[model samples]
Target chain A: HDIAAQHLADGIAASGPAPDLAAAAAFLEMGDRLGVVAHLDPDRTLETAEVAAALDLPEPALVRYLDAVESAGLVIREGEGRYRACPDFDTIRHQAGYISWTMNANRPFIENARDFFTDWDKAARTHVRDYREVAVSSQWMGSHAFYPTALATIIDAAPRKVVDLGAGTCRLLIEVLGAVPGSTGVGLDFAADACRAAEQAVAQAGMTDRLTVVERTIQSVATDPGVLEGADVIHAGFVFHDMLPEEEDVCDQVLANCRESLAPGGFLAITDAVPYLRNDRERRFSAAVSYYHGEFMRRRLQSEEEWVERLRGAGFSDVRALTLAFPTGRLFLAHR
Target chain B: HDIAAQHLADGIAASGPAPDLAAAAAFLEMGDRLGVVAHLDPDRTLETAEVAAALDLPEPALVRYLDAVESAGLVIREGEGRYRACPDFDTIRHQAGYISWTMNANRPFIENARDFFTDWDKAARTHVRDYREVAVSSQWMGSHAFYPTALATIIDAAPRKVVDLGAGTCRLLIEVLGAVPGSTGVGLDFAADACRAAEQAVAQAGMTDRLTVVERTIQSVATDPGVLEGADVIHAGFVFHDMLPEEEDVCDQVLANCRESLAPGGFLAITDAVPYLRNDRERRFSAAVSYYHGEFMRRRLQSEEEWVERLRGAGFSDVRALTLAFPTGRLFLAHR
Candidate 1:
């Protein structure tokens, strides 16, 4: 959180404010790829002649290349035709580059979806790869705004055994175990890469003794019932609502199993962007946000109220929701 | 213009402001396409069910689609799931839809160009199809903000025989003839579609006798010279700067020929977006603008001063430049 704030402040101080969603989305779609081709040089900055020579293009074509990338905020033109990389080149590259995997990683399924035909099994297969990229990159970058505080909340819950549903890289599991010495965790996710990354994270954090990861879908845990049998705290972050679109019945079963698996009066804390729209513009913004994510995951965005009601419907008591400082995000704390 | 102003006013009042160039580019690229697939229903307003049924998507996917297009300012979600077509739907459809051809229509050439390949003849062949979409739609939609005033300036020039080089849809040619009675025009373009559209527009405007469109490259006209004889004024709008990157020598030849082909003391008026950047932000903005056009056309932008110098260099005298009220555009008038 501190790092993000500092980065945000530096960006504002340097360039006023970041580009809007439209700009961000557009740049993410193709500008980053173009930037990589045009501006990303290993040797720092290069003259137009050097760049042209490097790219094997005529000087004029390179100039045109510079013009396009510079406009996209990917590179900075130093003087006449000389250019330097933008400070946010890495961020642009990371954000646009990494987030793009959700699309590129699932291009075939998306193409099928666009063609007005879909195979759920193929989509499920595509989903694993897509989620793994998002999960791994998201863990590395702290992509979720609900970061340290949300993780801290889990630590404060004082659970003896923690079960992390759709644990991407064992970030929350490792952190929880680090904070609470005796607490053990089980990290669960469908993706093999995610489970492997979680395993690596656990080992790196020296929590291999206390943390174990399973390579199985959360829905599978509903049928097996052995994967999450003894959890005092069941935490699902940025995972449940996504399930609502693709497999609502599976999500319902997972919620039900979470309730059955938790100890008496135990906590179940969930963190996600509870996206809602009040006015027409907000609706559109949410819509665009949805569209951005829809290209990959196509998750349903539920409001906090709807989420709390869902918890209540699953027979959980003392359901409470807290709106986080992050825009459109919230933390739902409930008890079994 | 009034409609645009009113729509702009309505949009600002409702949302705030639109996205920047990057955002606009991004939104237009896919949002417009999505808007077509989701909201381009036969009826005026569409229910979610109708959209879902049409696309053969689940109701939720259509809902997700609404969020994106709405966010793009292409459509309006009136109530919960109900939507009304935004006033600028057609404009969005045209501007975002048509300009996207530069990228989509030229995808193969872009790929080849990225791969260190060259085939100007092939690229030029691709260029015509891509440009035709932009030009024809741009003409109809008045995509350039400098349209009416720029046209008025040409009409006010009072030349008896006006020639429009690289005339897209002969918008200027037809308008000049309409506003200045007895003024004849020769519209020159390489695109067959552009020439056909010009022919159609001229015939529709009842100026068939007064207007003649030549379906040949401007470079061909430069060599032939007969095609431009008796031309008292030569006007090129929004076409010259774009030609600079691909063929600097060609643009120079065309300019020199334009000077030669004009009658003594004939006016040579050119209108284009002479965008200049002062700061890093502006540089990036201009870069995106360049990138946007660069995809298909790969043109270079010159400052007003550079343009004036270039015109002077081509042997034109009594050069005058006007900073049009339109954003990012300028009008340059010179004498042979």
Candidate 2:
């Protein structure tokens, strides 16, 4: 349950360049509200006054929206009170949609980014509401070509019991348990919203008896292994780096906890972006990676070598990497 | 006055990237209103709840602003519930200031961009008011190194009478008239705000007897030729391109009118971006030009050769160009 950097890159790449995504999204939202989009023609130079009159807006409001859109390079002002849409109108719209979706989907976390973890009560309320709204479909994940590869290996594991770490919306847990008959699952996460989403997903999937979820960080789970005791398989997918900057040794700590909780000879599967140092000269991909890592998340990506070292340090044996092509990350399979 | 793309390039280069200037400005404005800047330390990560409490804003309002700032990459989301200013925070602040100033200063034209030239009554009221508020200081124009180069030549003409087309706040007219005592000038534009601003600037400079402003388009001036009578120097600064796309033959028409209006051996000085085909691959400066022309103006950049041909085509002789270093444009001088 993670918003992978690769997905954002794919979404943006598919959408195309939006140098000012926030303004484009804001302008488009305002345009939609003011009925400006309907009034505007991509080919025709429309007069603002006529458009405002047609849309029943006070012209002044429409003017602000137009200024913003024009500033954002979404539209072109054709001299002396005429404006035509730019060539990149469609691309701008797509990029704006992606940006708006990402923002809205992560509203609670992004809005409360500065205080959520500390303000437990507020985080609890916002998380519960936000997760239900955003994490239900898992459609974005399906868009990734690498998702099938990860799904295939998980299905092959065929465990009767499973523990999903950082189980956002419990989509992975639901999919795995739903595919395996007589399988029971536990979805674990620190955020209350994630736990609530998991609960709702489990109920909706009609797997209430077979699944239970706990709201606690993996670090806490390490100290109190009550729920994780004797788990046949413990799987952490895409959430390792998310918690990195908060706790200095969070990734190692989580791996050690997973190792401690694993059933004898049982597997611990970890998946994330297999880290590679970005070649700065590669503008397109490197820039996208920077947007994800440096801009969105203040955490460094971990390479396979680094993760392998951490896994061995956490007392795991038989560390094997099942690399996926699409996202360029691998699943590290470890044993107790 | 114009907000040249080259100044923007230089400014941005001296500062740094600001992915979303509008949003950044909006966030900073909100922050100022909420006293958030005073309360938070740039180096320290602040707790959102604590900051909200200190500011006496409901947590939600603060959250929304923070989300926008974070999304703009002006601030870093430190771990679960903390945020701090990013490395480019100071630079983004400067860039945002420039953007906001440019927007507010040109409010009437920007706000009414779609039909400003067509909707007479609305343009009359807004242009008059907006120009006074925004165009008087000429701060935006002063940033360009090419401005002085253009100004020096205009002053060197030593004309007894001059006419400034699209006068804006009359900053240039006032400067020239103020420098040459007994030299009277006419400040002309269609927008009432610009005319009002020009009048105010002239009055402020104590050039009331030396300057008279007319709020009429060049087409009207062409038809009447009353205001253009007996002018030794007719200057159009940074606004010829601004009249583009609306009237396809506007530049030629204005030049013909200026030629018709000129007194014997009178000079016509035009300052604007010298036309060069955009080198799209050139990232910094050329991209900015594309934004100003292709994106905002919806017109192509005219090469110097095109302007020379147009000047000659309009019956002007001895057409010459004085290239400037800063703005990548030149001052075109012609005699009629």
Candidate 3:
């Protein structure tokens, strides 16, 4: 297997560790018990009591966990009265935010249906935007590259009917209408503002008739039985990862709906980061940030296999995955 | 007078020349007249008929303004049909938001009387709240030797009652307190969050009384009769530059306040970027990121003489200016 393939396999093995729930409390305890978490000076020493209070742990429990945590390299305890949060743990904790930023940068908030930021939508009106326009318009986001690549992905899929969820400004509908002249597109978006932007874009593209935008939550927008009744493909770009935690059920429902609507040989296309290929150093560093952002955004992230299994549950077969050249984007194409 | 000093003397030189007011109006008029602003590329280009119509102005009038705007470097017109807004103007438009973010980061919020982000107060609070926490705590802002060297001019001044404004998280304060133990400090700040952070720091250092957080604005607090009643010294580390547009007024206020507040032999100490002092092709190529950051953060950077004159305006006598060993900061000291 190539490095990418080997990494993929290793990533499977690394999936078992789920942040070690007892670690935080235990580390504090160990530090207190042995005075290991005391004055973190390299040459000088601090009062053990001061250190204990600082870490908020008693002497005894602090000793056990501190020793264990020290042994595990979560922290380092020097003789007398000093300790340092282990370089490894510190590395993990600190690097998390940056990695999350990298991941967030690559996430595609809207694809296929509408350019979300510009569009005015009626269905789901509440929305928040991220990043400055300069950052967005710069070469940084690969704005020049993103649309062309996405268009290629859809064209390669060659679906007769397509539904784009979280379609921001319905660029996909107009773009696809041009690419596949006979095909019709359904765009479901939550923001009414985005829907309005989509209307303008569609009108500009002169595809007002081929693109149909429904403003509602993807799960609630009843998939038109006729339009989606025999839909050949469903494409969810950056939307699925945000659905990893609380919205897992919603995702399942959406996928199932897509599956039901899909023709026998139809495909379901997804593009987003799946928990990265396992590299302990990279993962630990990235995980802290991933967890913080996941929690902050009220979104959960899943591993590739977890997503594949979920798709299997939704009745997709022949799972094939490919890494995207771009950061945090992965392509998983499956058919029913 | 030196070239820069001459500019300083006539600095308010009527906002540069507005080359073609009529032409600009005509160009814009041509666009409206043509009714195709959307199609005409607004990029910097030779005056074209489509642009004239898009701008709804007479063709000749449009050309004149375009020539002036192009000469002024406010816009760039590429060969073919490209016109773009001037890059610097685009950047200036975004500067306010950046300042707001910086203010928010330094002070947390503005409602509180103790917000350090605004440069109103300096004392122990300055040490506990400024960028050292940002540098040492965050990766990108790491504490490098160059940073300390930037304050060489201020340290050289050896002021008796130096007020460190917006002393972020107090790293600089700790250093100053250690370096100048004899200099009693009246730290001014408007950040309650930073003040709260400073209390612990002061307690930890056992210098709570000597270094006090004066919860007041520069006008109300720095000028208060009691705070630094006869300071004999005033200093701000990295706080002055961010408030560039208001810098002259602030200097005037600070000087006026310091005149009554200063001891007879007192001094005013200030440090900020030394304008274009290190602009060398080789160093720039090697550390281009430094150049980029300087542009992003300190675009309105004034020269040492510029600072001296501003201090003079504020009523300081016997002004002397010098560059720090570090290229990033310049210091000005004035005796009362």
Candidate 4:
């Protein structure tokens, strides 16, 4: 039995996480729960007591979280009582989003697997995700990984107006409107917290005059294509796939609506993950994220090939697919 | 910006979880949450709908969890609508404890890192962990990983009466008493649920007369020394480390008490973890589990060398330390 168990332990270490993935995940969850991402500064060592005071937690708790993070190679222990987040802030912030995406955002789905599997309708009615964690973590990934590409695509197109669907917090919208000079931008987000955040971002960026934040869903286009009205650039970053599970035609309707609503020669730029195959880089994150959107969101992601076909099918021509900083992610620029 | 972000993404890929650990953790979590570890029998291909009916989950949710486990290589996709757990079950069960120990047992610690870290008194007052999860998961690991060695030690000592401290559910105690015929056993567990479970298990095993359940703490010996009396063999598995955090002399007193209570020349076997360090096999699980105990339980674990020294210091002789199936764990057979 000891030999058998030893063999099993060795096999687990080889096939699964190096030490163990459960601990790794727990660390990531701890990272998110303690809100360590973007908070750690390389310029200064993170003192347990100082961080405890800041986070309104106790010093002992910080040491535990800190020690785990230190082992994960996210932070380096500088001294007995202080640690510093390693590599760089941008890297931590970008990679940390995977933590929230894996643990926090998907908690309802993961924790309720039995409930949801046993009784779909019952679990579906009750399963609620932490959208705030989603929004913030998504923003973390977006700002660091996908934003530069999406921003470049929209700016180069020189659209007179830009509209961001599911534009929680409006950072990208503000950046677009600010960079495009006189281009007017509208941000639509259904979450109340997202709307408030979007407004504050617009105000903070001094783009309130040029930007509008609307508390609404992009799915409204199924009835009226108003969210897309008068926009040269209709952008949906990671939101299009979410609409896939809404209705059979919801995604198609939204795409078709965007084509008609955009001004002549303008484009719809979408940024989202393509499905993860066995061959892709970042196989673990990619494949699990693919599983997540399909399982948790109930929205199957379109591969790059399928996305290009869908964009062309929506009556958009001259479609371009650009892979983003994240390998599984892509930015689609289609001319209308 | 795109190139820089891409570079950052590449760096994240190199430094972080091989695809991403968060997702890997998420997969392990899904494995445990869905109760798929042991339930995934290789003898039969797992059909999502069939499992949904058994586990009472919906087909869709099962599919999601199954797909994830498949990607993690825990199971292989047999074909459409079918999957099979790979490798073996004992391995899966043994390794899967890492998942529950991380995501489930440590949920209170990881989730409340901030609460506990910022204000220890406030957070400690409010935080509660699911001990049922800890008990079941601990048993899973114990039965597979550490039990073989501990059982061998106890049976070899051949004590007339055995006392198992922190004997949650009394599996080890039952195993001990069953192996040694006519050897009466006493199991002491503080948790109310554990007391009930211990009796049910003892009765089921037809050892009700041989084993007695006492609802009490090992710490109760501070005044009474009652829990330890009249026992030739005293076995404490993984509970000794927990005593380190209570007070300065609590552990010493308990050790001294155990030495005095054990019939002269009888041995006391302890199963516990040696702290993880810069170099060790199973570094991830070892280091994190070490961090978990220290941070979450506030109990510092003793090294093999330290354990032997402590046992000797507490008037025990001939301390023998043998590593268990789990790399970081050890069984100390110390004669009193």
Could you give the CAPRI-style class of model 2? incorrect
Better of 2 and 3 by lDDT: 2
The residue-by-residue lDDT of candidate 4 on B1-336, one tens digit each, is 454456456544533552455565566666665666546766778777766787666676667667766765557788888987766645555555666677667777777776565566776668877676676667656655677667766776787899998888788888888788889998988889879988999999998888999998878876668767778888888888877756648778888888888887887888888886444345556777787776656778888889988899988878977766564777787887
For candidate 3, the clash count comes to 89
lDDT per residue, candidate 1, B245-316, as tens digits? 777777877777778778887878887765534444334434434454545455677888888888888888
Position B122, candidate 4: lDDT: 77
lDDT of 1 by residue, A32-86 (tens): 3333344554347768777667656677766766666665556667788777767
lDDT by residue (A126-230, candidate 3, tens digit) is 333334221222122222223345556676666677878777777666777788768878887888888898888877877667788878776673443344666
The Cα local distance difference test for each model comes to: 0.60, 0.58, 0.47, 0.72
Model 1 residue A77 lDDT score: 76
Chain B TM-score of every predicted model:
0.63, 0.59, 0.50, 0.75
lDDT of 3: 0.47
Per-prediction DockQ comes to 0.16, 0.05, 0.01, 0.28
TM-score of chain A taken by itself, candidate 4: 0.77
The full ranking of all candidates by TM-score, starting with the best, is 4, 1, 3, 2
Worst 10 residues of 3 chain B by lDDT: B14-23
- List the candidate numbers ranked by lDDT, top first: 4, 1, 2, 3
lDDT of 3 by residue, B1-336 (tens): 132233222311211111111112222222222343223333444335776565545655445334433433334666544456554432221221111112212222111222222242442243343343233212111122123432343455465566666654555555666676576676677677777787788779877777776655555534454666767566666456656665656646765676567788877666565543333311211122222223223335666677777777767777866443222344566777
